[model samples]
Target: ELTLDPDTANPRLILSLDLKGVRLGERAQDLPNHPCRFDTNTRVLASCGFSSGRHHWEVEVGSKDGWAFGVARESVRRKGLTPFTPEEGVWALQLNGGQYWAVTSPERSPLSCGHLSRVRVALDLEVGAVSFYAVEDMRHLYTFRVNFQERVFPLFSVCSTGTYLRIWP
Candidate 1:
């Protein structure tokens, strides 16, 4: 199970991906690190950092598995500077329980090598709107989109893996 530090600040949403469960055919890199061994669980933390209503927050995430697995994400409105998942007050949206997709090639398991099609996390959240855009050419791809209903928070963890997930604000 995933847990969030209650003491953490507000407008935070943790985003993560289980590399171990990924299908072999879905890898785009042909390197040692490309073959993800993270099976236990993993976690990624994102921060809203700001409380500017009618504003936008974005994040860039990528891995070092010999590929350019990058993703651009953002969070929605600031329901007040509250905890991740408050007991009664307003809260931030979360990507703690979501999944993404992408193309794969055994020749180059990751884009760090030399691949056109890649799979990464890219998202955007503003006001009352949330969109998960695929990463392409370091920008948002126009093929797919993942929308959310409730607001998200920034506080994610692994369910059973140890993969060192990274992200940028």
Candidate 2:
């Protein structure tokens, strides 16, 4: 289980009472400015950081559009135009405009899946790998092979109003 770091949430991002669910709000919130908060994007980072060992977690994105989730290095920038790619310290899977993308630098790969409601992320830090799977039937979605040299946090992004992502413990 993981808890969201409300301090890292964007002003327009609405977090549930438990901080386990996040959605994009129709209007911006009267949020206080902070160094960890994202200033230009609708995203949030988990409070838990892992520097070594294997870890896994799941998130439900519902039927919403314009959402992404994955792991990000602790040094990732929290403001400006950030890319959901390895070069920018993020390795994520995004869904937008009826297409799914395995985020990467310079290019992104299209991913095919029947449903995306529940996604399971498995991270093997010792092996320098992370993979996504469909939780319903354990179907493979995508995998990222990279060396994580520092602490990393779970990351999530929601762009459309009324769309939410719930972390599953």
Candidate 3:
């Protein structure tokens, strides 16, 4: 089981009362500077961390556009530029500017997505692989292979109006 961590939310994000979803607000909210807070990514994290196990989660993505589902290291660089990759301790699949991309190092891997609604993420700790799938038919989308040496946190982000990411049990 997984639970959302409100303390890790970005000031510009509006977390739902249920604590399972998040969306971008028109303006920032006043939040204290928590060490785990995401100050620049417009993101949030799970309450628990995974170090060695297989985990899976499905998120209901919004149709309004820009959003992402991914995992980051417990010590994730929460306050720095955009387009963070695996090298930055993040592995994600995102809808950016009406297109899809696997945020990777060297260069982003571009993909053509038909119509994304829900995204299924599979994370294997021992093997250190993060796989993304299209929920409707479980179509394989992308995967990030890494040798995880530290505990990793599950994360998601919403950056556009009317868009949200909800992790459903």
- Per-candidate TM-score against the hidden true structure: 0.28, 0.95, 0.93
Q: 79 in model 1: Cα distance from truth in Å?
A: 20
Candidate order (TM-score) = 2, 3, 1
Q: What is candidate 2's lDDT per residue for 46-157, written digit by digit as tens?
A: 9999999999999988575778889999989988977667898888988877787888768888887776888999988999998999999989999999988999899999
Q: Which of the two, 2 or 3, has more TM-score?
A: 2
Q: Residue 130 lDDT in model 2?
A: 89
TM-score of 3: 0.93
Clash totals in order = 32, 0, 0
Candidate 2 wrongly placed segments (more than 4 Å): none
Ranking by lDDT: 2, 3, 1
Expressed as tens digits, the lDDT of each residue in 1-169 for candidate 3 is: 7778989998888888888888899998999988888888888998988888999988888876678779998878777655577777888888887778888777788877678888888999988798989999999999888888899888888878788888887
Writing each residue's lDDT as its tens digit, candidate 1 over 40-132 gives 222222334223233322333323222112212223222232222223222222222122323222211111223223323323434333232
TM-score of 2: 0.95
Q: How much is 150 displaced in model 1, in angstroms?
A: 11
Deviation of model 2 at 113, angstroms = 1.9
Best by TM-score: 2
